[PDB]
Protein backbone atom coordinates (compact mmCIF):
# COMPACT_ATOMS: atom_id res chain seq x y z
CA UNK A 1 0.00 0.00 0.00
CA UNK A 2 1.60 3.17 -1.36
CA UNK A 3 1.22 6.80 -2.45
CA UNK A 4 2.85 9.76 -4.16
CA UNK A 5 2.13 13.25 -2.81
CA UNK A 6 3.18 16.77 -3.75
CA UNK A 7 3.08 19.49 -1.04
CA UNK A 8 3.29 23.16 -2.13
CA UNK A 9 3.66 26.39 -0.08
CA UNK A 10 3.80 30.13 -0.94
CA UNK A 11 4.24 32.89 1.67
CA UNK A 12 3.93 36.51 0.61
CA UNK A 13 6.47 39.08 1.81
CA UNK A 14 4.70 42.42 1.29
CA UNK A 15 7.26 45.15 0.64
CA UNK A 16 10.23 42.77 0.40
CA UNK A 17 9.91 41.27 -3.10
CA UNK A 18 8.30 38.14 -4.67
CA UNK A 19 6.66 35.43 -2.38
CA UNK A 20 8.81 32.59 -0.99
CA UNK A 21 7.76 29.30 -2.62
CA UNK A 22 8.81 25.73 -1.60
CA UNK A 23 7.50 22.54 -3.22
CA UNK A 24 8.36 19.00 -2.19
CA UNK A 25 7.68 15.52 -3.48
CA UNK A 26 6.93 12.38 -1.54
CA UNK A 27 6.61 8.66 -2.14
CA UNK A 28 4.96 7.24 0.95
CA UNK A 29 7.08 8.79 3.68
CA UNK A 30 10.08 9.42 1.45
CA UNK A 31 11.17 12.71 -0.02
CA UNK A 32 12.44 12.42 -3.53
CA UNK A 33 12.47 16.01 -4.97
CA UNK A 34 12.29 19.65 -3.96
CA UNK A 35 12.26 23.23 -5.20
CA UNK A 36 13.08 26.40 -3.25
CA UNK A 37 12.71 29.89 -4.73
CA UNK A 38 15.51 31.08 -2.45
CA UNK A 39 18.23 28.58 -3.52
CA UNK A 40 20.66 29.29 -6.39
CA UNK A 41 19.91 26.42 -8.79
CA UNK A 42 16.31 27.56 -9.35
CA UNK A 43 16.03 23.98 -10.60
CA UNK A 44 13.90 21.13 -9.37
CA UNK A 45 16.35 19.13 -7.33
CA UNK A 46 16.59 15.47 -6.21
CA UNK A 47 16.51 14.23 -2.60
CA UNK A 48 16.36 10.47 -3.01
CA UNK A 49 19.28 8.51 -4.60
CA UNK A 50 17.02 6.49 -6.90
CA UNK A 51 15.71 9.51 -8.81
CA UNK A 52 19.00 10.89 -10.14
CA UNK A 53 18.96 8.53 -13.14
CA UNK A 54 16.19 10.48 -14.91
CA UNK A 55 17.69 12.24 -17.96
CA UNK A 56 17.64 16.01 -18.78
CA UNK A 57 14.16 15.77 -20.34
CA UNK A 58 12.82 14.73 -16.95
CA UNK A 59 14.11 17.57 -14.76
CA UNK A 60 13.33 20.02 -17.57
CA UNK A 61 9.66 18.99 -17.48
CA UNK A 62 9.47 19.04 -13.70
CA UNK A 63 11.26 22.38 -13.34
CA UNK A 64 8.84 23.65 -16.00
CA UNK A 65 5.76 22.52 -14.12
CA UNK A 66 7.07 23.49 -10.66
CA UNK A 67 7.71 27.08 -11.77
CA UNK A 68 4.19 27.14 -13.23
CA UNK A 69 2.91 26.28 -9.73
CA UNK A 70 5.13 28.97 -8.34
CA UNK A 71 3.60 31.60 -10.67
CA UNK A 72 0.03 30.44 -10.10
CA UNK A 73 0.43 30.82 -6.34
CA UNK A 74 1.83 34.32 -6.82
CA UNK A 75 -1.18 35.27 -8.93
CA UNK A 76 -3.41 33.40 -6.51
CA UNK A 77 -2.10 35.36 -3.53
CA UNK A 78 -3.09 38.63 -5.10
CA UNK A 79 -6.53 37.41 -6.14
CA UNK A 80 -7.40 35.84 -2.83
CA UNK A 81 -6.52 39.16 -1.22
CA UNK A 82 -9.28 40.71 -3.28
CA UNK A 83 -11.90 38.08 -2.65
CA UNK A 84 -11.51 38.71 1.04
CA UNK A 85 -11.19 42.52 0.98
CA UNK A 86 -7.76 42.42 2.53
CA UNK A 87 -4.99 45.02 2.27
CA UNK A 88 -1.47 44.74 0.89
CA UNK A 89 0.40 44.96 4.22
CA UNK A 90 -0.04 41.46 5.64
CA UNK A 91 1.89 38.29 4.91
CA UNK A 92 -0.38 35.51 3.55
CA UNK A 93 0.08 31.78 2.74
CA UNK A 94 -1.35 29.53 0.01
CA UNK A 95 -0.98 25.75 0.20
CA UNK A 96 -1.71 23.11 -2.52
CA UNK A 97 -1.54 19.29 -2.13
CA UNK A 98 -2.36 16.57 -4.64
CA UNK A 99 -1.43 12.91 -5.05
CA UNK A 100 -2.84 9.38 -5.48
CA UNK A 101 -2.99 6.24 -3.26
CA UNK A 102 -2.62 2.62 -4.48
CA UNK A 103 -3.41 -0.78 -2.96
CA UNK A 104 -1.37 -3.96 -2.29
CA UNK A 105 -1.58 -4.67 -6.02
CA UNK A 106 -0.46 -1.13 -6.97
CA UNK A 107 -3.89 -0.25 -8.46
CA UNK A 108 -5.66 3.12 -8.07
CA UNK A 109 -7.48 3.58 -4.72
CA UNK A 110 -8.06 7.27 -3.92
CA UNK A 111 -7.11 10.69 -5.27
CA UNK A 112 -7.01 14.22 -3.85
CA UNK A 113 -6.24 17.81 -4.82
CA UNK A 114 -6.48 20.27 -2.00
CA UNK A 115 -5.99 24.02 -1.72
CA UNK A 116 -5.81 25.97 1.53
CA UNK A 117 -5.62 29.70 1.97
CA UNK A 118 -4.03 31.06 5.17
CA UNK A 119 -4.12 27.58 6.76
CA UNK A 120 -7.89 26.86 6.27
CA UNK A 121 -9.42 24.74 3.48
CA UNK A 122 -10.22 26.78 0.37
CA UNK A 123 -11.26 24.43 -2.46
CA UNK A 124 -10.72 20.68 -2.82
CA UNK A 125 -11.59 17.89 -5.23
CA UNK A 126 -14.10 15.57 -3.53
CA UNK A 127 -13.65 11.78 -3.31
CA UNK A 128 -15.15 10.88 -6.72
CA UNK A 129 -12.79 13.46 -8.32
CA UNK A 130 -15.86 14.91 -10.07
CA UNK A 131 -17.06 17.92 -7.99
CA UNK A 132 -15.44 20.59 -5.77
CA UNK A 133 -15.79 21.73 -2.15
CA UNK A 134 -16.33 25.47 -1.73
CA UNK A 135 -15.87 26.53 1.89
CA UNK A 136 -16.73 30.15 0.98
CA UNK A 137 -18.49 32.46 -1.38
CA UNK A 138 -14.95 33.48 -2.23
CA UNK A 139 -14.17 29.88 -3.15
CA UNK A 140 -17.58 29.86 -4.83
CA UNK A 141 -16.07 32.21 -7.42
CA UNK A 142 -13.14 29.87 -7.97
CA UNK A 143 -15.31 26.77 -8.29
CA UNK A 144 -17.27 28.39 -11.11
CA UNK A 145 -13.96 29.26 -12.76
CA UNK A 146 -12.87 25.65 -12.63
CA UNK A 147 -16.28 23.98 -13.29
CA UNK A 148 -16.51 25.97 -16.55
CA UNK A 149 -12.88 25.19 -17.48
CA UNK A 150 -13.54 21.49 -16.69
CA UNK A 151 -10.58 21.21 -14.33
CA UNK A 152 -11.87 18.25 -12.29
CA UNK A 153 -12.01 16.08 -15.40
CA UNK A 154 -8.42 16.87 -16.40
CA UNK A 155 -7.04 16.42 -12.88
CA UNK A 156 -9.03 13.22 -12.66
CA UNK A 157 -7.35 12.24 -15.91
CA UNK A 158 -4.00 12.85 -14.23
CA UNK A 159 -4.81 11.56 -10.74
CA UNK A 160 -6.12 8.16 -11.99
CA UNK A 161 -3.81 7.98 -15.03
CA UNK A 162 -0.35 9.60 -15.08
CA UNK A 163 -0.10 9.65 -11.30
CA UNK A 164 -0.19 5.87 -10.74
CA UNK A 165 2.08 5.04 -13.67
CA UNK A 166 4.95 7.17 -12.44
CA UNK A 167 4.47 6.01 -8.85
CA UNK A 168 4.68 2.49 -10.33
CA UNK A 169 7.89 3.69 -11.99
CA UNK A 170 9.15 5.11 -8.70
CA UNK A 171 8.46 2.16 -6.35
CA UNK A 172 9.90 -0.08 -9.08
CA UNK A 173 12.96 2.06 -9.65
CA UNK A 174 13.77 2.06 -5.93
CA UNK A 175 12.27 -1.20 -4.62
CA UNK A 176 15.28 -1.75 -2.34
CA UNK A 177 14.25 1.49 -0.61
CA UNK A 178 10.53 2.17 -0.87
CA UNK A 179 8.97 -1.28 -0.37
CA UNK A 180 11.11 -1.91 2.70
CA UNK A 181 9.59 -2.44 6.16
CA UNK A 182 11.32 -1.56 9.42
CA UNK A 183 9.55 -2.87 12.52
CA UNK A 184 9.16 -0.99 15.87
CA UNK A 185 12.15 -1.61 18.09
CA UNK A 186 9.85 -1.53 21.14
CA UNK A 187 10.99 -0.47 24.60
CA UNK A 188 9.55 0.62 27.97
CA UNK A 189 10.81 2.88 30.80
CA UNK A 190 9.66 3.73 34.36
CA UNK A 191 10.00 7.07 36.20
CA UNK A 192 8.98 8.79 39.48
CA UNK A 193 6.62 11.70 40.18
CA UNK A 194 6.41 12.33 43.94
CA UNK A 195 6.85 9.01 45.81
CA UNK A 196 3.23 8.29 44.97
CA UNK A 197 2.76 7.58 41.21
CA UNK A 198 4.85 6.41 38.22
CA UNK A 199 4.92 6.74 34.43
CA UNK A 200 5.14 3.90 31.92
CA UNK A 201 6.41 5.14 28.55
CA UNK A 202 6.00 2.67 25.69
CA UNK A 203 8.84 3.44 23.23
CA UNK A 204 8.99 2.53 19.51
CA UNK A 205 12.00 3.38 17.36
CA UNK A 206 13.47 2.99 13.89
CA UNK A 207 10.36 1.97 11.91
CA UNK A 208 9.25 2.65 8.30
CA UNK A 209 6.74 3.58 6.98
CA UNK A 210 5.82 6.12 9.67
CA UNK A 211 2.27 4.70 10.13
CA UNK A 212 2.01 3.13 13.62
CA UNK A 213 -0.47 2.70 16.49
CA UNK A 214 0.44 2.87 20.21
CA UNK A 215 -2.54 2.16 22.47
CA UNK A 216 -2.54 1.35 26.21
CA UNK A 217 -4.70 -1.27 27.95
CA UNK A 218 -5.32 -1.60 31.70
CA UNK A 219 -6.80 -4.90 32.92
CA UNK A 220 -7.31 -5.89 29.27
CA UNK A 221 -9.33 -2.68 28.87
CA UNK A 222 -7.72 0.21 26.92
CA UNK A 223 -7.11 3.37 28.97
CA UNK A 224 -8.38 6.03 26.56
CA UNK A 225 -8.36 8.92 29.06
CA UNK A 226 -5.42 9.95 31.29
CA UNK A 227 -2.49 9.30 28.90
CA UNK A 228 0.19 11.23 27.01
CA UNK A 229 0.97 10.53 23.37
CA UNK A 230 3.51 12.34 21.15
CA UNK A 231 3.55 12.82 17.39
CA UNK A 232 5.63 10.38 15.35
CA UNK A 233 8.90 12.13 14.56
CA UNK A 234 11.76 11.53 12.07
CA UNK A 235 15.02 10.21 13.47
CA UNK A 236 16.62 11.86 10.40
CA UNK A 237 17.63 8.63 8.67
CA UNK A 238 14.47 7.51 6.91
CA UNK A 239 13.01 6.08 10.11
CA UNK A 240 10.46 7.35 12.58
CA UNK A 241 10.00 7.36 16.37
CA UNK A 242 6.95 7.63 18.65
CA UNK A 243 6.07 7.05 22.29
CA UNK A 244 2.96 6.78 24.44
CA UNK A 245 2.98 7.15 28.24
CA UNK A 246 0.63 6.71 31.24
CA UNK A 247 0.71 7.50 34.98
CA UNK A 248 -0.30 4.43 37.00
CA UNK A 249 -0.86 4.14 40.80
CA UNK A 250 2.37 2.90 42.40
CA UNK A 251 2.08 -0.90 42.69
CA UNK A 252 -0.33 -1.56 39.81
CA UNK A 253 2.55 -0.97 37.42
CA UNK A 254 2.05 -4.45 36.00
CA UNK A 255 -1.63 -4.48 35.07
CA UNK A 256 -0.95 -2.12 32.16
CA UNK A 257 -0.34 -3.30 28.57
CA UNK A 258 0.75 -1.34 25.47
CA UNK A 259 -0.34 -2.36 21.96
CA UNK A 260 1.99 -1.67 19.03
CA UNK A 261 0.52 -2.10 15.54
CA UNK A 262 2.46 -1.56 12.31
CA UNK A 263 2.44 -3.26 8.89
CA UNK A 264 6.02 -4.40 9.57
CA UNK A 265 5.02 -6.81 12.36
CA UNK A 266 3.74 -10.36 11.57
CA UNK A 267 1.76 -10.23 14.81
CA UNK A 268 0.70 -6.99 16.65
CA UNK A 269 2.92 -6.67 19.75
CA UNK A 270 1.85 -6.61 23.41
CA UNK A 271 4.13 -5.15 26.08
CA UNK A 272 4.08 -5.01 29.88
CA UNK A 273 6.30 -4.16 32.87
CA UNK B 1 5.88 13.33 -12.12
CA UNK B 2 3.88 16.51 -11.32
CA UNK B 3 0.65 17.59 -13.06
CA UNK B 4 0.19 19.83 -16.10
CA UNK B 5 -3.19 21.15 -14.97
CA UNK B 6 -2.24 24.29 -13.08
CA UNK B 7 -5.05 26.86 -13.30
CA UNK B 8 -5.53 30.18 -11.46
CA UNK B 9 -8.40 30.57 -9.02
Amino acid sequence: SHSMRYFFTSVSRPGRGEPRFIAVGYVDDTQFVRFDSDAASQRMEPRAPWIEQEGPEYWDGETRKVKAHSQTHRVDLGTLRGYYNQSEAGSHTVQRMYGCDVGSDWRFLRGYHQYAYDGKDYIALKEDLRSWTAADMAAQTTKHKWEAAHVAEQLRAYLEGTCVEWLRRYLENGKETLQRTDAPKTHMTHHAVSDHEATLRCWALSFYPAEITLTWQRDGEDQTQDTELVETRPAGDGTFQKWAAVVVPSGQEQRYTCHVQHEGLPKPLTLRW
Amino acid sequence: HMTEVVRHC
Partner: T-cell receptor
Amino acid sequence: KEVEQDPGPLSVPEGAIVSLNCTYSNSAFQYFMWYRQYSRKGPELLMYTYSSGNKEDGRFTAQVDKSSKYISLFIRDSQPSDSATYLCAMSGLKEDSSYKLIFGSGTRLLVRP
Amino acid sequence: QVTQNPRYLITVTGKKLTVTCSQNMNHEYMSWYRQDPGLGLRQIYYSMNVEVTDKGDVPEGYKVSRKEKRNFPLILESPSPNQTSLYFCASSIQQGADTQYFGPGTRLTVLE
Protein backbone atom coordinates in the same frame (compact mmCIF):
# COMPACT_ATOMS: atom_id res chain seq x y z
CA LYS C 1 7.05 21.76 -29.21
CA GLU C 2 6.78 21.04 -32.96
CA VAL C 3 3.84 20.09 -35.16
CA GLU C 4 4.20 18.70 -38.68
CA GLN C 5 1.17 18.63 -40.96
CA ASP C 6 0.75 17.92 -44.70
CA PRO C 7 0.30 21.34 -46.45
CA GLY C 8 -2.08 20.24 -49.25
CA PRO C 9 -4.07 20.90 -51.17
CA LEU C 10 -6.01 17.67 -50.76
CA SER C 11 -8.64 17.48 -53.54
CA VAL C 12 -11.49 15.03 -52.90
CA PRO C 13 -15.00 14.51 -54.37
CA GLU C 14 -18.11 15.39 -52.34
CA GLY C 15 -19.00 12.42 -50.14
CA ALA C 16 -15.42 11.30 -49.48
CA ILE C 17 -14.46 10.85 -45.82
CA VAL C 18 -11.58 13.32 -45.33
CA SER C 19 -8.78 12.51 -42.87
CA LEU C 20 -6.48 15.20 -41.54
CA ASN C 21 -3.48 14.43 -39.29
CA CYS C 22 -0.90 16.22 -37.17
CA THR C 23 1.87 14.46 -35.31
CA TYR C 24 3.68 16.07 -32.40
CA SER C 25 6.60 15.24 -30.13
CA ASN C 26 6.00 17.37 -27.01
CA SER C 27 4.82 15.13 -24.15
CA ALA C 28 3.59 18.29 -22.40
CA PHE C 29 0.65 19.24 -24.70
CA GLN C 30 -2.67 19.30 -22.84
CA TYR C 31 -5.21 21.03 -25.14
CA PHE C 32 -5.83 20.01 -28.74
CA MET C 33 -7.84 22.01 -31.23
CA TRP C 34 -9.02 21.84 -34.81
CA TYR C 35 -9.49 25.24 -36.45
CA ARG C 36 -11.14 25.87 -39.78
CA GLN C 37 -9.95 28.98 -41.71
CA TYR C 38 -11.84 30.00 -44.88
CA SER C 39 -9.56 31.96 -47.24
CA ARG C 40 -9.16 35.58 -46.06
CA LYS C 41 -10.97 35.14 -42.70
CA GLY C 42 -10.01 34.54 -39.07
CA PRO C 43 -9.58 30.91 -37.84
CA GLU C 44 -12.68 29.59 -36.05
CA LEU C 45 -12.90 26.69 -33.56
CA LEU C 46 -14.22 23.37 -34.79
CA MET C 47 -13.26 20.81 -32.11
CA TYR C 48 -11.77 20.96 -28.64
CA THR C 49 -10.51 18.15 -26.42
CA TYR C 50 -8.37 18.21 -23.28
CA SER C 51 -8.51 14.46 -22.86
CA SER C 52 -7.62 11.44 -24.99
CA GLY C 53 -10.30 9.49 -26.87
CA ASN C 54 -12.81 10.47 -29.55
CA LYS C 55 -15.25 13.40 -29.66
CA GLU C 56 -18.02 14.01 -32.28
CA ASP C 57 -19.98 17.01 -33.63
CA GLY C 58 -22.09 15.09 -36.17
CA ARG C 59 -20.09 15.14 -39.41
CA PHE C 60 -16.91 15.71 -37.41
CA THR C 61 -14.67 13.36 -35.40
CA ALA C 62 -11.58 14.35 -33.43
CA GLN C 63 -9.04 11.78 -32.26
CA VAL C 64 -6.20 12.37 -29.86
CA ASP C 65 -3.71 9.57 -29.12
CA LYS C 66 -0.90 10.62 -26.75
CA SER C 67 1.03 7.40 -27.47
CA SER C 68 1.51 7.90 -31.22
CA LYS C 69 1.39 11.68 -30.57
CA TYR C 70 -1.22 11.92 -33.30
CA ILE C 71 -4.14 14.38 -33.71
CA SER C 72 -6.86 13.48 -36.20
CA LEU C 73 -9.97 15.06 -37.70
CA PHE C 74 -12.43 13.13 -39.86
CA ILE C 75 -15.07 14.89 -41.88
CA ARG C 76 -17.54 12.25 -42.97
CA ASP C 77 -19.84 13.31 -45.81
CA SER C 78 -17.52 15.88 -47.37
CA GLN C 79 -19.41 18.86 -48.69
CA PRO C 80 -18.30 21.81 -50.92
CA SER C 81 -18.82 24.26 -48.00
CA ASP C 82 -15.94 22.48 -46.23
CA SER C 83 -13.25 23.83 -48.58
CA ALA C 84 -10.95 25.55 -46.13
CA THR C 85 -7.56 25.39 -44.55
CA TYR C 86 -7.73 23.24 -41.43
CA LEU C 87 -5.16 24.11 -38.74
CA CYS C 88 -4.41 21.85 -35.77
CA ALA C 89 -3.16 23.49 -32.56
CA MET C 90 -1.90 22.23 -29.21
CA SER C 91 -1.17 24.07 -25.97
CA GLY C 92 1.42 23.32 -23.28
CA LEU C 93 1.96 24.70 -19.79
CA LYS C 94 4.80 27.25 -19.74
CA GLU C 95 6.83 28.25 -16.67
CA ASP C 96 5.13 31.60 -16.42
CA SER C 97 2.01 29.41 -16.13
CA SER C 98 0.67 30.51 -19.47
CA TYR C 99 -0.42 27.83 -21.95
CA LYS C 100 1.30 28.39 -25.31
CA LEU C 101 -0.75 27.68 -28.42
CA ILE C 102 1.39 26.08 -31.18
CA PHE C 103 -0.23 25.60 -34.58
CA GLY C 104 0.43 23.18 -37.42
CA SER C 105 1.13 24.77 -40.82
CA GLY C 106 -2.46 24.04 -41.92
CA THR C 107 -3.93 21.60 -44.44
CA ARG C 108 -5.77 23.12 -47.41
CA LEU C 109 -8.90 21.11 -48.18
CA LEU C 110 -10.70 21.46 -51.49
CA VAL C 111 -13.80 19.24 -51.72
CA ARG C 112 -15.06 18.89 -55.30
CA PRO C 113 -18.85 18.86 -56.08
CA GLN D 1 -16.26 38.42 -31.02
CA VAL D 2 -12.72 39.90 -31.20
CA THR D 3 -12.05 43.12 -33.02
CA GLN D 4 -9.07 44.30 -34.87
CA ASN D 5 -8.60 47.76 -36.38
CA PRO D 6 -7.55 48.43 -38.98
CA ARG D 7 -8.39 45.43 -41.20
CA TYR D 8 -6.15 46.74 -43.99
CA LEU D 9 -3.30 49.24 -43.94
CA ILE D 10 -0.44 50.31 -46.19
CA THR D 11 2.65 52.21 -45.05
CA VAL D 12 6.03 53.16 -46.52
CA THR D 13 8.98 51.83 -44.51
CA GLY D 14 9.80 53.66 -41.28
CA LYS D 15 6.46 55.13 -40.10
CA LYS D 16 5.40 53.95 -36.64
CA LEU D 17 1.95 52.33 -36.83
CA THR D 18 -0.30 50.47 -34.39
CA VAL D 19 -2.95 47.77 -34.81
CA THR D 20 -5.52 47.87 -32.01
CA CYS D 21 -7.37 44.77 -30.82
CA SER D 22 -10.43 44.78 -28.59
CA GLN D 23 -12.82 42.55 -26.68
CA ASN D 24 -15.58 43.06 -24.11
CA MET D 25 -15.82 39.37 -23.30
CA ASN D 26 -13.88 39.80 -20.05
CA HIS D 27 -11.04 37.48 -21.20
CA GLU D 28 -7.64 38.10 -19.51
CA TYR D 29 -5.30 36.50 -22.04
CA MET D 30 -4.60 38.20 -25.33
CA SER D 31 -1.91 37.53 -27.91
CA TRP D 32 -0.93 38.61 -31.43
CA TYR D 33 0.06 36.15 -34.20
CA ARG D 34 1.34 36.60 -37.72
CA GLN D 35 0.48 34.30 -40.64
CA ASP D 36 2.86 33.90 -43.62
CA PRO D 37 2.75 31.24 -46.44
CA GLY D 38 4.52 28.03 -45.35
CA LEU D 39 5.63 29.41 -41.98
CA GLY D 40 2.17 28.85 -40.50
CA LEU D 41 1.03 30.81 -37.42
CA ARG D 42 3.70 32.42 -35.20
CA GLN D 43 3.15 34.16 -31.85
CA ILE D 44 4.73 37.61 -31.53
CA TYR D 45 3.77 38.81 -28.05
CA TYR D 46 1.13 37.96 -25.48
CA SER D 47 -0.28 39.04 -22.17
CA MET D 48 -1.71 36.77 -19.53
CA ASN D 49 -3.55 39.75 -17.91
CA VAL D 50 -3.55 43.52 -17.22
CA GLU D 51 -0.07 45.09 -16.94
CA VAL D 52 1.26 41.64 -17.84
CA THR D 53 3.11 41.17 -21.17
CA ASP D 54 5.76 38.81 -22.61
CA LYS D 55 7.62 38.02 -25.87
CA GLY D 56 6.56 35.23 -28.23
CA ASP D 57 8.42 33.17 -30.84
CA VAL D 58 8.86 36.23 -33.07
CA PRO D 59 8.99 39.48 -30.97
CA GLU D 60 11.84 41.32 -32.64
CA GLY D 61 10.68 44.56 -34.28
CA TYR D 62 7.34 44.64 -32.42
CA LYS D 63 6.16 45.95 -29.05
CA VAL D 64 2.86 45.92 -27.11
CA SER D 65 1.13 47.18 -23.91
CA ARG D 66 -1.74 45.98 -21.71
CA LYS D 67 -2.83 49.12 -19.89
CA GLU D 68 -6.52 48.14 -20.10
CA LYS D 69 -7.96 44.62 -20.02
CA ARG D 70 -10.06 44.90 -23.15
CA ASN D 71 -7.33 46.11 -25.53
CA PHE D 72 -4.03 44.62 -26.62
CA PRO D 73 -2.30 46.96 -29.13
CA LEU D 74 0.46 45.76 -31.52
CA ILE D 75 3.04 48.52 -32.12
CA LEU D 76 5.72 48.65 -34.85
CA GLU D 77 8.22 51.46 -34.06
CA SER D 78 10.02 51.20 -37.41
CA PRO D 79 8.28 48.98 -40.06
CA SER D 80 10.50 46.72 -42.21
CA PRO D 81 9.43 45.48 -45.68
CA ASN D 82 9.31 41.88 -44.44
CA GLN D 83 6.85 42.71 -41.69
CA THR D 84 4.27 42.41 -44.45
CA SER D 85 1.87 39.76 -43.09
CA LEU D 86 -1.60 38.76 -41.97
CA TYR D 87 -1.82 39.71 -38.29
CA PHE D 88 -4.35 38.03 -35.98
CA CYS D 89 -5.13 38.93 -32.40
CA ALA D 90 -6.50 36.12 -30.25
CA SER D 91 -8.12 36.25 -26.80
CA SER D 92 -8.45 33.63 -24.07
CA ILE D 93 -10.62 33.68 -21.00
CA GLN D 94 -7.72 32.53 -18.81
CA GLN D 95 -3.95 31.90 -19.11
CA GLY D 96 -4.02 31.07 -22.79
CA ALA D 97 -5.67 27.79 -21.78
CA ASP D 98 -8.54 25.97 -23.51
CA THR D 99 -9.83 27.65 -26.67
CA GLN D 100 -8.41 30.87 -28.17
CA TYR D 101 -10.79 33.18 -30.05
CA PHE D 102 -9.37 34.83 -33.17
CA GLY D 103 -9.71 38.33 -34.63
CA PRO D 104 -10.95 38.77 -38.24
CA GLY D 105 -7.37 39.63 -39.28
CA THR D 106 -5.36 42.76 -40.18
CA ARG D 107 -3.70 42.64 -43.58
CA LEU D 108 -0.47 44.67 -43.70
CA THR D 109 1.88 45.75 -46.50
CA VAL D 110 5.09 47.74 -45.83
CA LEU D 111 6.56 49.11 -49.05
CA GLU D 112 10.02 50.30 -50.17
